Design an enzyme around this catalytic site. Structure first.
Site, PDB file in Angstrom:
ATOM      1  N   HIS A   1      12.041  -2.339  15.114  1.00 50.01           N
ATOM      2  CA  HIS A   1      11.216  -3.523  14.820  1.00 50.01           C
ATOM      3  C   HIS A   1      11.449  -4.638  15.824  1.00 50.01           C
ATOM      4  O   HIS A   1      11.976  -5.711  15.509  1.00 50.01           O
ATOM      5  CB  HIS A   1      11.462  -4.020  13.390  1.00 50.01           C
ATOM      6  CG  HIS A   1      10.854  -3.143  12.333  1.00 50.01           C
ATOM      7  ND1 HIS A   1      11.604  -2.284  11.550  1.00 50.01           N
ATOM      8  CD2 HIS A   1       9.563  -2.961  11.959  1.00 50.01           C
ATOM      9  CE1 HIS A   1      10.805  -1.647  10.711  1.00 50.01           C
ATOM     10  NE2 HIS A   1       9.558  -2.031  10.948  1.00 50.01           N
TER      11      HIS A   1
ATOM     12  N   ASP B   1       0.011  -0.443  12.084  1.00 53.41           N
ATOM     13  CA  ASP B   1       1.454  -0.446  11.878  1.00 53.41           C
ATOM     14  C   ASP B   1       2.046   0.953  12.096  1.00 53.41           C
ATOM     15  O   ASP B   1       3.156   1.097  12.619  1.00 53.41           O
ATOM     16  CB  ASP B   1       1.779  -0.930  10.459  1.00 53.41           C
ATOM     17  CG  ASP B   1       3.054  -1.745  10.382  1.00 53.41           C
ATOM     18  OD1 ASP B   1       3.747  -1.892  11.398  1.00 53.41           O
ATOM     19  OD2 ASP B   1       3.360  -2.255   9.272  1.00 53.41           O
TER      20      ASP B   1
HETATM   21  C1  LIG Z   1       8.072   7.017  11.280  1.00 53.49           C
HETATM   22  C2  LIG Z   1       8.256   6.206  10.034  1.00 53.49           C
HETATM   23  N1  LIG Z   1       8.885   6.686   9.011  1.00 53.49           N
HETATM   24  C3  LIG Z   1       9.031   5.882   7.870  1.00 53.49           C
HETATM   25  C4  LIG Z   1       9.697   6.408   6.781  1.00 53.49           C
HETATM   26  C5  LIG Z   1       9.865   5.667   5.632  1.00 53.49           C
HETATM   27  C6  LIG Z   1       9.358   4.388   5.598  1.00 53.49           C
HETATM   28  C7  LIG Z   1       9.491   3.583   4.395  1.00 53.49           C
HETATM   29  O1  LIG Z   1       9.738   2.386   4.414  1.00 53.49           O
HETATM   30  N2  LIG Z   1       9.200   4.370   3.310  1.00 53.49           N
HETATM   31  C8  LIG Z   1       9.203   3.842   1.973  1.00 53.49           C
HETATM   32  C9  LIG Z   1       9.187   4.977   0.979  1.00 53.49           C
HETATM   33  C10 LIG Z   1       9.109   4.444  -0.432  1.00 53.49           C
HETATM   34  C11 LIG Z   1       7.842   3.630  -0.585  1.00 53.49           C
HETATM   35  C12 LIG Z   1       7.855   2.473   0.387  1.00 53.49           C
HETATM   36  C13 LIG Z   1       9.071   1.614   0.137  1.00 53.49           C
HETATM   37  C14 LIG Z   1      10.334   2.430   0.297  1.00 53.49           C
HETATM   38  C15 LIG Z   1      10.306   3.569  -0.690  1.00 53.49           C
HETATM   39  C16 LIG Z   1      10.408   2.983   1.702  1.00 53.49           C
HETATM   40  C17 LIG Z   1       7.953   3.009   1.794  1.00 53.49           C
HETATM   41  C18 LIG Z   1       8.689   3.827   6.656  1.00 53.49           C
HETATM   42  C19 LIG Z   1       8.539   4.594   7.788  1.00 53.49           C
HETATM   43  N3  LIG Z   1       7.876   4.088   8.911  1.00 53.49           N
HETATM   44  C20 LIG Z   1       7.280   2.893   9.221  1.00 53.49           C
HETATM   45  C21 LIG Z   1       7.263   1.623   8.501  1.00 53.49           C
HETATM   46  C22 LIG Z   1       6.074   1.028   8.136  1.00 53.49           C
HETATM   47  C23 LIG Z   1       6.059  -0.194   7.495  1.00 53.49           C
HETATM   48  C24 LIG Z   1       7.241  -0.847   7.226  1.00 53.49           C
HETATM   49  C25 LIG Z   1       8.436  -0.275   7.599  1.00 53.49           C
HETATM   50  C26 LIG Z   1       8.439   0.952   8.230  1.00 53.49           C
HETATM   51 CL1  LIG Z   1      10.001   1.592   8.654  1.00 53.49          CL
HETATM   52  N4  LIG Z   1       6.779   2.988  10.440  1.00 53.49           N
HETATM   53  N5  LIG Z   1       7.044   4.240  10.939  1.00 53.49           N
HETATM   54  C27 LIG Z   1       7.720   4.882  10.015  1.00 53.49           C
HETATM   55 MG   LIG Z   2       6.979  -5.040   8.640  1.00 47.07          MG
HETATM   56 ZN   LIG Z   3       5.449  -3.193  11.800  1.00 41.49          ZN
END
Ligand SMILES: Cc1nc2ccc(C(=O)N[C@]34C[C@H]5C[C@H](C[C@H](C5)C3)C4)cc2n2c(-c3ccccc3Cl)nnc12
Ligand SMILES: [Mg+2]
Ligand SMILES: [Zn+2]
EC number: 3.1.4.17
Length: 342
Positions: A81, A233
């Site tokens: 980030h 995103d």
């Molecule tokens: C590659 C990749 N993997 C990712 C694997 C997991 C998660 C993640 O926060 N999963 C969740 C799974 C459940 C339901 C909700 C809240 C929590 C519990 C956590 C989401 C995000 C992931 N992610 C993002 C991303 C997008 C927006 C914000 C933060 C991030 Cl990190 N951008 N790329 C990725």
């Molecule tokens: Mg964010």
């Molecule tokens: Zn972002």
């Protein structure tokens, strides 16, 4: 001072034509993370120009140059980030503009707000999620935990703080209706980057895609902005395997670092945050199946020209399946030693 000299060139030199950045700069196949970080502020200016925002909204060029640099400098350097994330998210917004005819769905000011929101949407991220804010009783939780979306409220507040910095308010000549409108849009769009929020409104997104987009429906505008933002995103998933592999690495570096802190606090991290329990291939497959693929399926449903994006995410999910076996150690490890069992 570095920034003032970077500003002086960025303001007085002129704006590079987008094609000079890369011949495929406006293609869904282009990987903005390929652009050297030192070129990204110029590229932001180039995209703003090419989308005609600078002319349409009569943006002051000194103000804009300062604003873009302030936004870049408003990101820290956690593995994922950081500014290059915000830049690649913004670039995807630009791709959507160049490839999808957003002006058939959205007002000019909404498209403008979307792009600025992309630049700002993770401002001052510290590499930890919302639950960590509350768990660690951070200042951010003290401010915002009663409302939820702690980090995203902070990102928005930081965007506002930049605008409220003298010489940085790229909207200060706006009419009062338009100024109020832009800031309201930035609020909604940045708050929409909380995946909890996406998951809450997913069914509304489906209903909208199923009945068909109504450009006279104000709720449809709101919903679409949310879906587009989320699409930006997660847009690292729409490139090649190499991009997904690297971004998984950056993501889990960040996650496991938070998990290590949670353990030091005496709490049990989520599985996906625990470097001793997280099995990256199934976690990434889950993320792509349950979150990323449905989002681009909806995008394709609304914009038939977005079809290739979905098939790319689907293909990348297939690759994770194909490489999963490599996470099992067969034979001896590279060093021919079983010492690691101790
Ligand atoms: C590659 C990749 N993997 C990712 C694997 C997991 C998660 C993640 O926060 N999963 C969740 C799974 C459940 C339901 C909700 C809240 C929590 C519990 C956590 C989401 C995000 C992931 N992610 C993002 C991303 C997008 C927006 C914000 C933060 C991030 Cl990190 N951008 N790329 C990725
Ligand atoms: Mg964010
Ligand atoms: Zn972002």
């Amino acid at each position: 001072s570095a920034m003032d000299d970077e500003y002086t060139k960025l303001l007085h030199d002129g704006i590079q034509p987008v094609a000079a950045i890369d011949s495929n700069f406006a293609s869904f196949t282009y990987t903005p993370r390929s652009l050297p970080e030192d070129d990204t502020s110029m590229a932001i200016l180039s995209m703003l120009q090419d989308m005609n925002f600078i002319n349409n909204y009569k943006i002051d060029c000194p103000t804009l140059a300062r604003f873009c640099l302030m936004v870049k400098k408003g990101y820290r350097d956690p593995p994922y980030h950081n500014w290059m994330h915000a830049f690649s998210v913004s670039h995807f917004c630009y791709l959507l503009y160049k490839n999808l005819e957003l002006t058939n769905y959205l007002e000019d000011i909404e498209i403008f707000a979307l792009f600025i929101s992309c630049m700002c949407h993770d401002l001052d991220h510290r590499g930890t999620n919302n639950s960590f804010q509350v768990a660690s009783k951070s200042v951010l939780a003290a401010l915002y935990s009663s409302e939820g979306s702690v980090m995203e409220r902070h990102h928005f507040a930081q965007a506002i703080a930049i605008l409220n910095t003298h010489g940085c308010n790229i909207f200060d000549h706006f009419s009062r209706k338009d100024y109020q409108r832009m800031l309201d849009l930035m609020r909604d769009i940045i708050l929409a980057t909380d995946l909890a929020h996406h998951l809450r409104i997913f069914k509304d997104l489906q209903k909208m895609a199923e009945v068909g987009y109504d450009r006279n429906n104000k709720q449809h505008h709101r919903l679409l902005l949310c879906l587009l933002m989320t699409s930006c995103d997660l847009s690292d998933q729409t490139k090649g395997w190499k991009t997904t592999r690297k971004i998984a690495e950056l993501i889990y570096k960040e996650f496991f670092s938070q998990g290590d802190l949670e353990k030091a606090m005496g709490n049990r991290p989520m599985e996906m945050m625990d470097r001793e329990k997280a099995y990256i291939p199934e976690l990434q497959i889950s993320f792509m199946e349950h979150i990323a693929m449905p989002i681009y399926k909806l995008l394709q449903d609304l914009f038939p020209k977005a079809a290739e994006l979905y098939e790319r995410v689907a293909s990348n999910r297939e690759h994770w399946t194909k490489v999963s076996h490599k996470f099992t150690i067969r034979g001896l490890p590279s060093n021919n030693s079983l010492d690691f069992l101790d």
